[PDB]
Amino acid sequence: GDFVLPELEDVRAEAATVDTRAVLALAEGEEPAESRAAVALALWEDRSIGTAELQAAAEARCGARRPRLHTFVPLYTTNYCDSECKMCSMRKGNHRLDRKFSGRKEITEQLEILYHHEGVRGVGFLTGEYEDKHTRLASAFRIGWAIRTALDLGFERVYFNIGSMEQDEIDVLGEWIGREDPVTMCVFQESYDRETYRRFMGKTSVGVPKADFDRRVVSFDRWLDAGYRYVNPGVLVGLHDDLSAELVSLVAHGDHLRSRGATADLSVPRMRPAMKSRDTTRVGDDDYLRLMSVVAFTCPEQRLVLTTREPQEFQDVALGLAGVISPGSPDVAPYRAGCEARNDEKSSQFLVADLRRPRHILGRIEASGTPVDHFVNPAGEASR
Amino acid sequence: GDFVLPELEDVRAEAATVDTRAVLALAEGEEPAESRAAVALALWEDRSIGTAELQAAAEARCGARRPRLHTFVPLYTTNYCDSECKMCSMRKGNHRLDRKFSGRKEITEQLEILYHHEGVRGVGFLTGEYEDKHTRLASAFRIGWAIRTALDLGFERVYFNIGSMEQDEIDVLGEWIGREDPVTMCVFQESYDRETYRRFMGKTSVGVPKADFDRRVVSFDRWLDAGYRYVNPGVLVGLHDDLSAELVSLVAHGDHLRSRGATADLSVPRMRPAMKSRDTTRVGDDDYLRLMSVVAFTCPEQRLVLTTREPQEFQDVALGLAGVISPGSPDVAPYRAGCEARNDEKSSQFLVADLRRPRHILGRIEASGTPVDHFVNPAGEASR
Numbered sequence: 001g002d003f004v005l006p007e008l009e010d011v012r013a014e015a016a017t018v019d020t021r022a023v024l025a026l027a028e029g030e031e032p033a034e035s036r037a038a039v040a041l042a043l044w045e046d047r048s049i050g051t052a053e054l055q056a057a058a059e060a061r062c063g064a065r066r067p068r069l070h071t072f073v074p075l076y077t078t079n080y081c082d083s084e085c086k087m088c089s090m091r092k093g094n095h096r097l098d099r100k101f102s103g104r105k106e107i108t109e110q111l112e113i114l115y116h117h118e119g120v121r122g123v124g125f126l127t128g129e130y131e132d133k134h135t136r137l138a139s140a141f142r143i144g145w146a147i148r149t150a151l152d153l154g155f156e157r158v159y160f161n162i163g164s165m166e167q168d169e170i171d172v173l174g175e176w177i178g179r180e181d182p183v184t185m186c187v188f189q190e191s192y193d194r195e196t197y198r199r200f201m202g203k204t205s206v207g208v209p210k211a212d213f214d215r216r217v218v219s220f221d222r223w224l225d226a227g228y229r230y231v232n233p234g235v236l237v238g239l240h241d242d243l244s245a246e247l248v249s250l251v252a253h254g255d256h257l258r259s260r261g262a263t264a265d266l267s268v269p270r271m272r273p274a275m276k277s278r279d280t281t282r283v284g285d286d287d288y289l290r291l292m293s294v295v296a297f298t299c300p301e302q303r304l305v306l307t308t309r310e311p312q313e314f315q316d317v318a319l320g321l322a323g324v325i326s327p328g329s330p331d332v333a334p335y336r337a338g339c340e341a342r343n344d345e346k347s348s349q350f351l352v353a354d355l356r357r358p359r360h361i362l363g364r365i366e367a368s369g370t371p372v373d374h375f376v377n378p379a380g381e382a383s384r
Numbered sequence: 385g386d387f388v389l390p391e392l393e394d395v396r397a398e399a400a401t402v403d404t405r406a407v408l409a410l411a412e413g414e415e416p417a418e419s420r421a422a423v424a425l426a427l428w429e430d431r432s433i434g435t436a437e438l439q440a441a442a443e444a445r446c447g448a449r450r451p452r453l454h455t456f457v458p459l460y461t462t463n464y465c466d467s468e469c470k471m472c473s474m475r476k477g478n479h480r481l482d483r484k485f486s487g488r489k490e491i492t493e494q495l496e497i498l499y500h501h502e503g504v505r506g507v508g509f510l511t512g513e514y515e516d517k518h519t520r521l522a523s524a525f526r527i528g529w530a531i532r533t534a535l536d537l538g539f540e541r542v543y544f545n546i547g548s549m550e551q552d553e554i555d556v557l558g559e560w561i562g563r564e565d566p567v568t569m570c571v572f573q574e575s576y577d578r579e580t581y582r583r584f585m586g587k588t589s590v591g592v593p594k595a596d597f598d599r600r601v602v603s604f605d606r607w608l609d610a611g612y613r614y615v616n617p618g619v620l621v622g623l624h625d626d627l628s629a630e631l632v633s634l635v636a637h638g639d640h641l642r643s644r645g646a647t648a649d650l651s652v653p654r655m656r657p658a659m660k661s662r663d664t665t666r667v668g669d670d671d672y673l674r675l676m677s678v679v680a681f682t683c684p685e686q687r688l689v690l691t692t693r694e695p696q697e698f699q700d701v702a703l704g705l706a707g708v709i710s711p712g713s714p715d716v717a718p719y720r721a722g723c724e725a726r727n728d729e730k731s732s733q734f735l736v737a738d739l740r741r742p743r744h745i746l747g748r749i750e751a752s753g754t755p756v757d758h759f760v761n762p763a764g765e766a767s768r
């Protein structure tokens with residue numbers, strides 16, 4: 001009943017049988033005979049189909065989706081972590097980081113700034129991942145409180161991203177919400193290749209909690225077992241060299257979740273500068289746009305998430321492939337009324353490319369002709 | 385400005401000069417010329433004064449105090465702990481314990497049982513003590529939420545006992561309350577002798593958080609620096625062989641706190657059965673009553689706390705020396721409507737002597753002629 005990784009050579013054989021031209025000719029809402037992972041792989045590898053042309057087809061295939069876009073802004077509630085991801089500044093072994101923790105007052109204040117000054121109605125809560133059972137339970141407790149507090153303030157959509165979760169940790173978080181609340185669990189597998197995964201996340205059985213690949217990947221299945229609905233898998237683009245392998249696995253994971261009745265967003269964040277202990281693969285814009293396109297096309301009801309990891313000029317080109325736009329900063333309690341958010345290298349998880357205020361970024365998107373749901377521009381008669 | 389341990393040989397020399405008969409002749413509210421620690425020591429060592437006679441004098445000296453008694457019931461919110469106290473079942477190295485953790489739902493349910501079925505308006509929240517800064521902050525956060533939740537339910541007095549606390553941990557807890565709220569910090573030094581302390585609590589600088597004697601003993605001073613008022617020092621009777629040394633130090637600590645304007649309760653819990661790694665000194669009833677008497681007499685505005693560690697027959701004899709009566713069980717979420725509380729050896733901190741329901745114990749005290757504040761007997765027209 002739990003997700004099982006696809007056999008990449010099996011998908012390759014099925015991809016060899018799809019007619020990619022016929023696929024592009026499909027009407028919106030119409031579904032290929034072959035599996036999504038096989039169709040995505042075939043589109044990816046058929047270089048007679050230009051990336052620009054794939055992108056236009058993906059945007060059209062997703063064109064009917066309503067709302068076109070919605071938003072959430074991240075709120076990192078702490079930058080403590082017990083794990084050791086080599087591409088992340090929050091890794092426990094990074095003794096250079098200034099560690100911070102938001103209490104009741106600070107979390108509430110940040111939510112009020114986001115709500116009234118940035119005009120947003122979507123928020124995400126983030127933490128590190130912790131090793132011992134009591135710390136994981138206490139973290140779930142705190143984040144559960146934060147989710148409930150946000151919902152009560154009038155946030156209409158809440159994400160959380162707090163590491164892998166076992167059944168009893170979900171129990172503790174779940175006592176804060178209802179099974180029908182608009183709450184999405186985020187757990188990016190980073191890489192679905194077990195060998196690349198171990199290279200960046202570490203080896204198991206040594207107090208490094210995220211090194212357990214399996215606990216992480218079945219977290220959505222536990223969430224669904226408990227009766228919840230919204231989930232957000234992802235790949236960290238730049239870890240594994242073979243992008244065709246990751247897109248096959250992510251699309252396979254999305255497809256599994258869909259079969260279980262879940263609503264899934266799909267995230268493919270691209271690497272940003274951080275205090276790393278191993279370096280990564282820089283993925284060019286064309287490969288990245290091609291990847292987003294084949295995922296968006298074959299998974300048309302599963303929204304891609306685009307974040308301010310990316311610079312303004314890239315958002316300009318890619319926004320049409322996305323279903324979620326998420327501006328913000330990965331620093332602890334970084335927001336302040338009337339000021340740009342902090343992204344201090346001394347305390348941030350990584351450095352973002354776009355530090356413009358969410359309400360500016362989202363306002364410009366709306367002014368260009370795309371409304372953003374969960375955004376209320378704090379303007380005119382809706383200004384205080 | 386912080387508490388400094390008295391020099392025991394200096395107190396001995398001052399004790400040699402007090403007239404213990406003149407001391408007993410003092411009118412209530414009148415104060416000896418010598419220091420409290422010196423007077424307590426002299427009363428202790430003057431065996432021409434019988435223990436029964438000391439007890440009668442202490443009770444009379446405290447007779448004017450109003451209310452005569454108030455109550456709180458303990459609620460252990462978890463039995464996880466990172467420390468290694470050799471006399472305690474919750475020590476991390478005790479792999480036999482079944483570890484439990486109460487979330488939002490369970491804590492609320494327990495408070496409602498205590499409030500409506502046991503009729504109590506005083507509660508104490510307890511945890512283990514944790515090593516890494518994030519866990520300590522997350523624990524402070526949770527317990528802060530619990531205190532606020534209890535106060536909002538109508539609890540009129542809340543204790544907490546969650547280990548030593550540094551300034552930033554107090555900050556996190558304090559965001560849940562007001563400086564004038566009826567909230568008491570408990571931090572029992574266990575032994576004021578540094579050598580006995582190290583024997584049971586462990587050596588410092590090795591991830592054993594309670595091994596730091598100094599961080600622990602100045603926790604009240606940090607609490608007072610932040611502008612709070614109520615504190616609860618204690619000695620664990622049975623650790624250190626020389627009781628005269630501990631009573632000198634506890635009375636000295638009480639006196640210091642008083643000088644800083646604090647309201648202090650004083651706790652002298654006696655050892656109970658547990659899964660220990662070192663055994664302790666069994667203190668007989670006469671020594672124990674003599675100890676309670678000299679502390680109660682010399683510190684007449686600082687209430688002794690008596691708990692159901694002690695059997696019914698001992699409470700009968702000692703209750704007149706106490707200002708706080710605290711029935712309950714040191715098991716996680718042990719209460720249930722209409723049932724006696726759990727005290728399961730598989731999950732409890734230690735085994736208590738008296739498992740009768742708080743409302744029975746407190747009702748019998750009231751029926752015998754002593755009202756108990758923060759107790760509303762759920763009887764007659766106050767029954768639902």
Ligand SMILES: Nc1ncnc2c1ncn2[C@@H]1O[C@H](CSCC[C@H](N)C(=O)O)[C@@H](O)[C@H]1O
Nearest residue numbers: 087088127128129163188236271272274350
């Ligand atoms: N240098 C870096 N640049 C860009 N994204 C990164 C990054 N390091 C990590 N990330 C991504 O940030 C995401 C959310 S933050 C991590 C939250 C949680 N501790 C967890 O690890 O699941 C991570 O999952 C990762 O995909």
Ligand SMILES: Nc1ncnc2c1ncn2[C@@H]1O[C@H](CSCC[C@H](N)C(=O)O)[C@@H](O)[C@H]1O
Nearest residue numbers: 471472511512513547572620655656658734
């Ligand atoms: N076997 C035992 N019998 C009786 N009391 C004990 C005991 N072991 C510990 N205690 C007492 O229980 C008290 C409260 S419980 C401990 C709470 C917190 N972890 C702390 O250590 O401060 C301890 O301070 C100790 O004085």
Ligand SMILES: N[C@@H](Cc1c[nH]c2ccccc12)C(=O)O
Nearest residue numbers: 074307308309326327328329330
């Ligand atoms: N990293 C998380 C949270 C996030 C959302 N938008 C962001 C913008 C910048 C940094 C982090 C974020 C995610 O991709 O879901």
Ligand SMILES: N[C@@H](Cc1c[nH]c2ccccc12)C(=O)O
Nearest residue numbers: 458691692693710711712713714
């Ligand atoms: N041990 C804590 C909490 C407590 C109060 N009353 C108790 C009765 C039994 C066991 C524990 C307690 C204390 O002495 O303050």
Ligand code: SF4
Nearest residue numbers: 081083085088090091
């Ligand atoms: S990616 Fe998450 S688990 Fe890994 S080091 Fe960073 S914060 Fe910790």
Ligand code: SF4
Nearest residue numbers: 465467469472474475
């Ligand atoms: S007395 Fe407190 S700190 Fe020590 S082992 Fe027990 S619960 Fe942990």
Ligand SMILES: [K+]
Nearest residue numbers: 372373375376
């Ligand atoms: K809008």
Ligand SMILES: [K+]
Nearest residue numbers: 756757759760
């Ligand atoms: K009463």
